Point group: none
Chain length 201, copies 2
């Protein structure tokens, strides 16, 4: 049998994970500043709570996914806005007001200057998950790492986990639903359409 390994993030994983994060959104679209996608979606976890990050490796020891289990959502989104967004703004300048001109990088850079955080559901769902998988990862492996990260959060006293899932990820949404997640509402994560989904414990 193919052995997948789920293991803690190590700092040396960063470049590989930024590349996966770019591919999952891909590396053909963002040719000027490929790092901007990871900066938006992954860097905050690496900076604030790297111990939240689990990495998924396939049978050939290749990184094919990650999952962040964020114990304290409220604190995460607060510090995202106050600590991380300040940093990525300083790295990714506001583009000119001509929306026509804009490269894909410039759409995302502009989105950093127009941030609204998702609804605080932290009193009902303490925690949240962030996940990205290669199209190759078996669904049963995705279910395993989800079941793992939910046990980890519950073991740390979480009473519930939300997730902002890209609305277009039909297959992934079906996996979360089948595990007991329900759709709460839609939310725009900067330039990105999401469904806010959630589960108790």
């Amino acid at each position: 049998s193919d052995a997948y390994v789920i293991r803690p993030f190590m700092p040396s994983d960063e470049e590989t994970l930024y590349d996966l994060c770019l591919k999952s959104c891909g590396d053909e679209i963002y040719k000027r500043e490929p790092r901007i996608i990871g900066d938006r979606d992954l860097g905050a976890y690496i900076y604030l709570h790297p111990e939240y990050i689990y990495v998924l490796e396939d049978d050939r020891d290749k990184i094919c996914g990650y999952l962040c289990g964020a114990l304290d959502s409220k604190q995460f989104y607060e510090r995202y806005e106050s600590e991380w967004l300040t940093q990525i703004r300083d790295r990714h300048p506001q583009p000119e007001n001509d929306i026509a001109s804009w490269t894909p990088e410039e759409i995302v850079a502009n989105s950093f200057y127009n941030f609204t955080p998702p609804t605080d559901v932290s009193v009902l769902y303490l925690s949240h998950l962030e996940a990205r998988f290669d199209s190759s990862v078996p669904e049963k492996v995705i279910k395993r790492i989800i079941r793992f990260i939910l046990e980890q959060l519950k073991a740390k006293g979480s009473y519930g986990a939300s997730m902002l899932i890209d609305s277009w990820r039909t297959n992934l949404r079906r996996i979360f639903t089948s595990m007991g997640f329900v759709d709460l509402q839609e939310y725009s994560w900067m330039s990105e359409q999401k469904c806010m989904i959630a589960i108790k414990l």
Copy 2:
């Protein structure tokens, strides 16, 4: 086409009972120790893992199989020399409260008392920090694929390297031919064979 997904993750206090069970089943060649350590079977876990759980639980990683069964553990001790200073100065008082000193009749000793004696007559492993800063522990049930064992060892070594380790040692039971072959196949060398808390060990090591 068939897939299993293993988790390596930090120890949580709730793991202790299952880990102690794995230690007990693993401690004697071709025997679960559950039928020999009839009086105080927790003395095995206390010997094998107690010092880590007490002093440095962050050193302990637990392996889960595809259906959440704990099927192994490893310890990555970044600084062996400090770890065994703490083992002597802090842990030995605690483990001697859990396990009494045997009476002076060696002939009549239970398996528990043979182990308990080691706690009252402790000597730290050879100090090999001139070559190897860190040390390991590793125990896997029968179910764990060797390819997973190797990947999980490498993870602990990569973690130690990242934290500044230039090398790792390990005491392995000399009778554990299979696990010794795995470590040797990964580039570990045998430095020494010597009794360490009443058990015949090989001290093995790799540079990082």
